[PDB]
Design a protein around this ligand. Structure first.
Ligand SMILES: CC(=O)N[C@H]1[C@H](O[C@@H]2[C@H](O[C@]3(C(=O)O)C[C@H](O)[C@@H](NC(C)=O)[C@H]([C@H](O)[C@H](O)CO)O3)[C@@H](O)[C@H](O[C@H]3[C@H](O)[C@@H](O)[C@H](O)O[C@@H]3CO)O[C@@H]2CO)O[C@H](CO)[C@H](O)[C@@H]1O[C@@H]1O[C@H](CO)[C@H](O)[C@H](O)[C@H]1O
Ligand SMILES: CC(=O)N[C@H]1[C@H](O[C@@H]2[C@H](O[C@]3(C(=O)O)C[C@H](O)[C@@H](NC(C)=O)[C@H]([C@H](O)[C@H](O)CO)O3)[C@@H](O)[C@H](O[C@H]3[C@H](O)[C@@H](O)[C@H](O)O[C@@H]3CO)O[C@@H]2CO)O[C@H](CO)[C@H](O)[C@@H]1O[C@@H]1O[C@H](CO)[C@H](O)[C@H](O)[C@H]1O
Ligand SMILES: CC(=O)N[C@H]1[C@H](O[C@@H]2[C@H](O[C@]3(C(=O)O)C[C@H](O)[C@@H](NC(C)=O)[C@H]([C@H](O)[C@H](O)CO)O3)[C@@H](O)[C@H](O[C@H]3[C@H](O)[C@@H](O)[C@H](O)O[C@@H]3CO)O[C@@H]2CO)O[C@H](CO)[C@H](O)[C@@H]1O[C@@H]1O[C@H](CO)[C@H](O)[C@H](O)[C@H]1O
Ligand SMILES: CC(=O)N[C@H]1[C@H](O[C@@H]2[C@H](O[C@]3(C(=O)O)C[C@H](O)[C@@H](NC(C)=O)[C@H]([C@H](O)[C@H](O)CO)O3)[C@@H](O)[C@H](O[C@H]3[C@H](O)[C@@H](O)[C@H](O)O[C@@H]3CO)O[C@@H]2CO)O[C@H](CO)[C@H](O)[C@@H]1O[C@@H]1O[C@H](CO)[C@H](O)[C@H](O)[C@H]1O
Ligand SMILES: CC(=O)N[C@H]1[C@H](O[C@@H]2[C@H](O[C@]3(C(=O)O)C[C@H](O)[C@@H](NC(C)=O)[C@H]([C@H](O)[C@H](O)CO)O3)[C@@H](O)[C@H](O[C@H]3[C@H](O)[C@@H](O)[C@H](O)O[C@@H]3CO)O[C@@H]2CO)O[C@H](CO)[C@H](O)[C@@H]1O[C@@H]1O[C@H](CO)[C@H](O)[C@H](O)[C@H]1O
Ligand SMILES: [Zn+2]
Lengths: 105, 249, 105, 105, 105, 105
């Protein structure tokens, strides 16, 4: 079963949640520090998310997608586009991004 | 909608002699106060057609067209902005003097309107650029609205699309708010000597043009936003209005 | 022979179809979740397409092109550019993108 | 005598020709279909060019440049900038891009 | 625990300091010369920072983040966006960038 | 040992010269032809520079920086950003770029 949308996709995983945001990223933080090679984003209401440091929890097939998501979040920040939804793992803090939805007019 | 050429989306702002963009917030105040005579503009052309119009009302609509830039205006009974009527019959429909002192002045020439307005009407209507339906009165309404909104652009510190680098009484034209990545209508600040705005807008829309179609383009609006804060014409925040989109590549 | 255009290309494959859209992407969905590392796009009329999760159906020569297409779709979403045509495999759900045409003609 | 420009470069190869366009790309086509992983561009006058599928005709040193050229063509298409010249091989159909010149002059 | 922001992150390392800038990059310098493959940025007040040449002080997990950071700094320079904070190692000259914060709050 | 700027960097190498340009790139040329996988740029006054074909004169640590410089030059061309200075090796023709400075000051 290949999902058609982010909600169906998110429902294929345990410990995930959909956040319906419809707002721009307020702060973008990027780190190259050893063992903390990660991106953190936050919104104006204080909601905070990460793209995790690559680790043993990730399949080989996820390594390039982690980098793609960080590219997408950086582009979203620079352009000020609204994020429609995030699917995030709730068993990490900040909540860890699994998928993103961008939606327009 | 087709894809508007970059040259028709290019917007030029009025910089001073030191490469610094004029700040229209500093020039007009936070609220632009402007005056108009007893309205009642009247056009008389023959081929015959008569038409009477409230200068005050048409200026009002035009200003509202530019509102997304964040500007605020204020009509005031006669250093402020002036809208007047002249009769030079100069083959020139409208003209504006941008004055950094606040006394910028816009004129609408009735003599030119009476002489030359209809000269492209039948040419356009055959091109499919304006509806075959369109009446000679509506066309004169259309040209007057375009003319006023276009001159308002000059009031708000804009020059013509092709006047980057060119020298002017109070300085030089410098491109502002560049955005080539977002498709959009041609600028209403197209150089009228080189472009027919109605024709170009019609080419963009792939259909005949109406009054509801015309107005400042996305880049036109972003350009005035730049003019509202001024600063260096060399500043990247002034020069570009969608360069962040580059990150998506 | 070498195709000259997307229709020629699409006709070189079984189970493909040309869709003429002339529409901007309405929704962009990107997932890094394991086994669902994919991009999904949809248009205002509900038409939905995927770039498939890389798998055994893909040649080694297709691995970088899958990533290129995902880059192109993200850029298309952000800029709101109209997509002229998609060549898509119809034996997948959502239909799976094989090629894209962007045209300003 | 080292090449100084695209004409010098093009003259260092057999079966190549310089095409002067001074036009934006009118159509951009990108395919990830297997054995047709390629880009095709065309101009309003109908002139059509490709970046070839990577193959045995390419040195290892050409593999990343093939990807760079496809990146440059996509960026040119999205930005609507004029292409000044292409150097292309005439023994492929569509003519195959060897080099590109962009000029604002 | 996983840090929530650049200050928490910076405090997880020795010889680091947070610089609050809220300024655009004034000069961007990029070198490909051997043993000096690096980027240097400066601000209008003269503050200067580098992304270090990759070396034995870097984990393998830091190699791509070094490149990402250089990408982010170039994009920040070109767009003229304000940099909110840098976390930098002070035991290098210029001070060496560990993390960056961009904020529109 | 601790360069702070492009003048320091250029003085750490033999056979280099500084060009103060403060001009946008006038012509950008990119080639994928075998043995000439290179970029050439020129300015309105005719000053011409290359990024060299990767070769035995390059350290492994310079391979990705060569690609980064070509990315930077292409971005500068597309945006019309002014190049402040180039540090270039004079024993190649066109002069070979070692470092670039972009300045808005
Ligand atoms: C829930 C969990 O622990 N996730 C870890 C996962 O564990 C696998 C199974 O979990 C799912 C899941 O993530 O929800 C189950 C889903 O149906 C799968 N969905 C799809 C579309 O395939 C996903 C998916 O396959 C993986 O995520 C892709 O790697 O996996 C989990 O239920 C199963 O649990 C076993 C348990 O291990 C065993 O001891 C017990 O006896 O039986 C249980 C039930 O069978 O274990 C599966 C792995 O063998 O495994 C991945 C690595 O494969 C990760 O460790 C994942 O952790 C999350 O990883 C995320 C990033 O990918 C993120 O960091 C989250 O914070 C982590 O929790
Ligand atoms: C139809 C199909 O199953 N496609 C799979 C392909 O199978 C190969 C042959 O199919 C074509 C095709 O895809 O249409 C035939 C075309 O003429 C070829 N076109 C060109 C320009 O080369 C393509 C192309 O070579 C490949 O797609 C590139 O990898 O292949 C298919 O006809 C052939 O069928 C055999 C059959 O397997 C055998 O049992 C029977 O006895 O004889 C038949 C006739 O020879 O099998 C070919 C493979 O040996 O194989 C590729 C992998 O190489 C994929 O599995 C492809 O499936 C599609 O993959 C797409 C992504 O690339 C996408 O996910 C689609 O949804 C998949 O169906
Ligand atoms: C013309 C040709 O067949 N090109 C193929 C090339 O063959 C080599 C020699 O050709 C040139 C060339 O491409 O014009 C000659 C140039 O002077 C060289 N220029 C420079 C700056 O070095 C280039 C260049 O070295 C290569 O292109 C880099 O790979 O090569 C060709 O003259 C020579 O021919 C031999 C012949 O094979 C032999 O039977 C006969 O007895 O003697 C001839 C003269 O010595 O063969 C050379 C290779 O041994 O080789 C490359 C692969 O290295 C390609 O196959 C190239 O084909 C073109 O490739 C393009 C993409 O790179 C594109 O796809 C074109 O459509 C292909 O024709
Ligand atoms: C301070 C230092 O030497 N840093 C180098 C580091 O050394 C490791 C330990 O330092 C920390 C640190 O950097 O502050 C300690 C932190 O709590 C760690 N933080 C987290 C979140 O993990 C970090 C982190 O693990 C690494 O930075 C990631 O690679 O490490 C340091 O305290 C420890 O010192 C030993 C010492 O080696 C030994 O002589 C003595 O007997 O015991 C001490 C206490 O245990 O050594 C740790 C490594 O074994 O190591 C990394 C590479 O592994 C770097 O060399 C780092 O140097 C900095 O590197 C930066 C770029 O990554 C930048 O270039 C700075 O300028 C370098 O100083
Ligand atoms: C001048 C030269 O030939 N450069 C080649 C270089 O040679 C090395 C030494 O040169 C320097 C230099 O490039 O100026 C000396 C600098 O102080 C170094 N600076 C720093 C910050 O380290 C640089 C730097 O290390 C390298 O460029 C990084 O690769 O190197 C040169 O003085 C030395 O000469 C030897 C000579 O070989 C030997 O016969 C004699 O007995 O002793 C001399 C004095 O010690 O040789 C050094 C290498 O062994 O080597 C690199 C390869 O590592 C290149 O070949 C470089 O050529 C330039 O390369 C550029 C691209 O990187 C560009 O293409 C230029 O056009 C090339 O000339
Ligand atoms: Zn005008």
């Amino acid at each position: 079963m290949t999902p058609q949308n982010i909600t169906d996709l998110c429902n294929e995983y345990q410990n995930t949640m959909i956040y319906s945001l419809n707002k721009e990223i307020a702060t973008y933080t990027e780190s190259l520090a050893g063992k903390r090679e990660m991106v953190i984003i936050s919104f104006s209401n204080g909601a905070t998310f990460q793209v995790e440091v690559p680790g043993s929890q990730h399949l080989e097939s996820q390594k390039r997608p982690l980098e793609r998501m960080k590219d997408t979040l950086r582009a979203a920040y620079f352009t000020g586009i609204k994020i429609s939804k995030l699917c995030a793992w709730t068993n990490k803090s900040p909540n860890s991004i699994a998928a993103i939805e961008l939606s327009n007019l | 909608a087709e894809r508007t050429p970059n040259e028709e989306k290019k917007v030029i702002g009025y910089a001073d002699h030191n490469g610094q963009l004029y700040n229209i917030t500093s020039i007009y105040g936070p609220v632009i106060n402007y005056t108009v005579p007893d309205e009642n503009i009247t056009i008389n052309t023959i081929n015959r057609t008569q038409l009477t119009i409230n200068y005050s009302d048409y200026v009002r609509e035009a200003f509202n067209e530019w509102a997304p830039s964040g500007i605020r205006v204020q009509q005031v009974s006669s250093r402020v902005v002036s809208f007047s009527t002249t009769n030079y019959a100069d083959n020139s429909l409208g003209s504006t003097i941008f004055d950094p002192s606040g006394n910028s002045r816009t004129r609408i020439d009735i003599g030119s309107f009476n002489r030359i307005v209809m000269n492209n009407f039948e040419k356009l209507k055959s091109r499919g650029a304006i509806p075959a339906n369109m009446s000679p009165e509506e066309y004169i309404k259309l040209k007057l609205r375009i003319t006023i909104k276009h001159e308002i652009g000059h009031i708000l510190g804009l020059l013509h699309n092709n006047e980057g680098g060119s020298y002017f009484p109070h300085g030089v034209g410098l491109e502002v708010a560049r955005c080539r990545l977002l498709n959009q209508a041609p600028s209403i600040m197209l150089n009228g000597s080189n472009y027919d705005y109605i024709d170009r807008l019609s080419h963009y829309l792939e259909r005949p043009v109406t009054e509801t179609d015309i107005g400042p383009s996305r880049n036109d609006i972003e350009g005035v936003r730049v003019m509202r804060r001024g600063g260096s014409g060399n500043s990247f925040t002034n020069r570009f209005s969608c360069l962040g989109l580059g990150l998506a590549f």
